[PDB]
Every structure is written in C-alpha cells, then in structure tokens.
Design an enzyme around this catalytic site. Structure first.
Site, PDB file in Angstrom:
ATOM      1  N   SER A   6       3.785   2.134   8.766  1.00  0.00           N
ATOM      2  CA  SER A   6       3.397   1.209   7.697  1.00  0.00           C
ATOM      3  C   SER A   6       4.564   0.764   6.843  1.00  0.00           C
ATOM      4  O   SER A   6       5.394   1.586   6.458  1.00  0.00           O
ATOM      5  CB  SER A   6       2.362   1.865   6.804  1.00  0.00           C
ATOM      6  OG  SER A   6       1.134   1.905   7.467  1.00  0.00           O
ATOM      7  N   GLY A   7       4.635  -0.535   6.558  1.00  0.00           N
ATOM      8  CA  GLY A   7       5.743  -1.085   5.781  1.00  0.00           C
ATOM      9  C   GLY A   7       6.875  -1.598   6.659  1.00  0.00           C
ATOM     10  O   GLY A   7       7.668  -2.449   6.228  1.00  0.00           O
TER      11      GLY A   7
ATOM     12  N   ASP B 211      -0.786  -7.348   1.444  1.00  0.00           N
ATOM     13  CA  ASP B 211      -0.104  -6.061   1.617  1.00  0.00           C
ATOM     14  C   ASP B 211       1.383  -6.270   1.850  1.00  0.00           C
ATOM     15  O   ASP B 211       1.889  -6.190   2.982  1.00  0.00           O
ATOM     16  CB  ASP B 211      -0.734  -5.222   2.737  1.00  0.00           C
ATOM     17  CG  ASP B 211      -0.293  -3.764   2.704  1.00  0.00           C
ATOM     18  OD1 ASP B 211      -0.548  -3.045   3.686  1.00  0.00           O
ATOM     19  OD2 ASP B 211       0.284  -3.311   1.701  1.00  0.00           O
TER      20      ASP B 211
ATOM     21  N   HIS C 119       0.809  -1.212   0.000  1.00  0.00           N
ATOM     22  CA  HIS C 119       0.000   0.000   0.000  1.00  0.00           C
ATOM     23  C   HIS C 119       0.848   1.271   0.000  1.00  0.00           C
ATOM     24  O   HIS C 119       0.417   2.305  -0.509  1.00  0.00           O
ATOM     25  CB  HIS C 119      -1.045  -0.010   1.131  1.00  0.00           C
ATOM     26  CG  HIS C 119      -0.540   0.476   2.457  1.00  0.00           C
ATOM     27  ND1 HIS C 119      -0.229  -0.376   3.494  1.00  0.00           N
ATOM     28  CD2 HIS C 119      -0.346   1.730   2.932  1.00  0.00           C
ATOM     29  CE1 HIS C 119       0.162   0.325   4.541  1.00  0.00           C
ATOM     30  NE2 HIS C 119       0.099   1.609   4.229  1.00  0.00           N
TER      31      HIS C 119
END
Ligand SMILES: Cc1cc2cc(/N=C(/NC#N)N[C@H]3CCCCN(CC(=O)N4CCCC4)C3=O)ccc2o1
Ligand SMILES: [Ca+2]
Ligand code: NA
Lengths: 238, 84
Positions: free
Chosen positions: A185-186, A88, A42
């Site tokens: 995120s990530g 994801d 994402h």
C-alpha cells in the site's frame, strides 16, 4: 507482492518505504523528486510517527546505499474518505533532499491527457513493494515487482464487493496467483512507454491477496496529476 | 515509370524521391501524424494544437531542437532504471 520477482539492482529505483517508530516498513511510496514522495492517504493513519527510506533492497541487512529521510510536510488529500478509500493519495515533502544514485531515482509524472490515451490503454503496468509475498504469508525482506494487466472498469466494478470510484482502477489477474498485498500500500504502479516509466497508480486496497475473482485496487493517478503539481509547487518553507 | 505515390519522383529496380510529408518505398505513407499513431513520433508526451502535434518532456528532460526527442539534464532523469 504475491508472485512476480525480486527487483534487480537499479530496476525499481523509485520505490520508497515508509518506516514506523520501530523502523519497520508498513507502507510503500514513490519517489517523485528530491523532495517529494507519493503515497496513499490511508497509510498515514497506520503509524504514530514515520520516516521514508530510499534505496532499500533487503531490509534484513544494512547493505549501504540506503537513506532515511524525515518528513517535513504531510500533504494528505483533504477529500480522502475512510469508508471508501476514495482520494487515497498523499504527498510528503522531505526535510532533506534525496541524493539520486544507483537504485534511487524518481519516476515520471505523466501529462494527464496523454497518460489517459497512451498509458492507461496499455496491456500492463508494474506494481512493486516489500509487502507480503503470500495473503497468509510474511512481508518480503526483498523488494519485488510484478507485471499486472489493466482490467476494464466494468469488470473491475462487477468483481468488487465495494464501490470502485472514478479515482480508482483495477489491475491484476482473475485467478492467477499474482497480486500486490498488505505492506505494498502506498507503493508505485508504473507504466512503461519507450523505456521510460511513468507513475500511473498508487497501491490502495483489495479483498484478500491474489484471491480468485478479485483484483488489486489502485488510486488512479491521472485524476490527481493537477493536485500533485499544486502540492509540489509549494516547494520549501517561506 | 506511376509507381511513386503522392507526387513522388520516380527513378530507376525503381526508386521514389518523396515529397516532404510522405515516406515509405512509394511515398504512400504520411509522415505527418497525430498522437494516436506512433505517439506522433514524440519520445514522451504528445498533444495536438490545431490538427498538429506538439511534443513535450517530463521533469529533468528538455525537448530537443527537432521538437521530438527528450534530452536528460543529468544522470538520473525521471523514469529511467539506474544503470550506475
Ligand atoms: C493493489 C492491491 C491489492 C491489495 C490487497 C491487499 N490486501 C488486503 N487484505 C488482505 N489480505 N487489504 C485490506 C487490508 C485490511 C483492511 C481492509 N482493506 C481495505 C478495504 O477492504 N477497503 C474496502 C473499500 C475501502 C477500503 C484492505 O485493503 C491490500 C492492499 C492491496 O493493494
Ligand atoms: Ca537494508
Ligand atoms: Na485475482
């Protein structure tokens, strides 16, 4: 990261940072080897152009020891689904190899079956990143880490307004004010076994940060070990 | 002396000289274990082949001759916080 504490020198060496056109961090990543970064699919849709910074501890100063790597190949999981965030996950191959040094080292990819029975059955994992230190606050200039309890799948599902697929897990606290957040995120979710840290998750999504009754949602890395191996087998350009 | 278990040899303030495959003060504990117990004595990965434990190691480690320990191939093996 809401709550938790700053990573000390050499404590969170597999953290990577995705930096956008303005050289601002917008997502995290995990160093897997000299050429490969693990991140969330994402995140790829959230910057026009991006590079990868490793060995950064404070973003407000150029402390030295930081390195910026250009992306050669983006390997997004072709099954990434925008409305659910299922699959994801992405791998990035870098143009130039990472020089491992103090604060810059790969996390281990575990064997699938052993990870399921030995890592996912632990009380906690550790999440880290430069993300917001509060839901309503600002992104950290300092890399933080946070120990987060694994949450059983049923409690995960019933806590959530949205679908928890089998490629996701919950981690964190019911009401305690500690969580990953926006900007994380990530980034890595790692599980320690006998003084060695193994990649177990990718920071994916969540409703708010550290909300009461809500958990952090992570991409379940065990589902994707075979896919990660295949992506990393490619190696350099022919 | 029958305090030593599993055909262990009793001597004496007694001692037990355990048969291979057994440990503990009285040879009452199996050394042979599957991955569900003490990770099968593997440093890292454990998996079973025909009721038997085979250990392995992650990238940048080699399995020691003893078949349990993982040996780094350099100062930056995966999953270790950096000392220097
Ligand atoms: C472990 C973890 C907790 C966590 C919390 C996060 N916080 C937020 N928002 C806030 N205050 N995440 C939102 C960001 C805004 C877009 C909506 N969103 C995605 C979202 O809500 N989804 C529902 C299903 C598929 C995606 C977020 O994750 C973001 C990432 C996170 O990763
Ligand atoms: Ca810096
Ligand atoms: Na919560």
């Amino acid at each position: 990261i809401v709550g938790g504490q700053e990573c000390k020198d050499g404590e969170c060496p597999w953290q990577a940072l995705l930096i956008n056109e303005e050289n601002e961090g917008f997502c995290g990543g995990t160093i897997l080897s000299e050429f490969y970064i693990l991140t969330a699919a994402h995140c790829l849709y959230q910057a026009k152009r991006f590079k990868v910074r490793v060995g950064d501890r404070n973003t407000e100063q150029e402390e030295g020891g930081e390195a910026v790597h250009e992306v050669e190949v983006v390997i997004k999981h072709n099954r990434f689904t925008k409305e659910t965030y299922d699959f994801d996950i992405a791998v990035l191959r870098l143009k130039t190899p990472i020089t491992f040094r103090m604060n810059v080292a790969p996390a281990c990819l575990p064997e699938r079956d052993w990870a399921e029975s030995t890592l996912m059955t632990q009380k906690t994992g550790i999440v880290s990143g430069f993300g917001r230190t509060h839901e309503k606050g600002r992104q950290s200039t300092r890399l933080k880490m946070l120990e987060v309890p694994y949450v059983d799948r049923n409690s995960c599902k019933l806590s959530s307004s949205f679908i928890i697929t089998q490629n996701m897990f919950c981690a964190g606290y019911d009401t305690k004010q500690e969580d990953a957040c926006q900007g994380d995120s990530g980034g890595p979710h790692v599980t320690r076994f006998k003084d060695t840290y193994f990649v177990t998750g990718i920071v994916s999504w969540g409703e708010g940060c550290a909300r009461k009754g809500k958990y952090g949602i992570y991409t379940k890395v065990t589902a994707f070990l075979k896919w990660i191996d295949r992506s990393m087998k490619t190696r350099g350009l022919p | 002396c029958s305090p030593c278990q599993n055909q262990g040899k009793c001597k004496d303030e007694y001692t037990c000289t355990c048969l291979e495959g057994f440990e503990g003060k009285n040879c009452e504990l199996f050394t042979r274990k599957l991955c569900s117990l003490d990770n099968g004595d593997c440093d890292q990965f454990c998996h079973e082949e025909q009721n038997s434990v085979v250990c392995s190691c992650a990238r940048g480690y080699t399995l020691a001759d003893n078949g349990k320990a993982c040996i780094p191939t350099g100062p930056y093996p995966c999953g270790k916080q950096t000392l220097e």
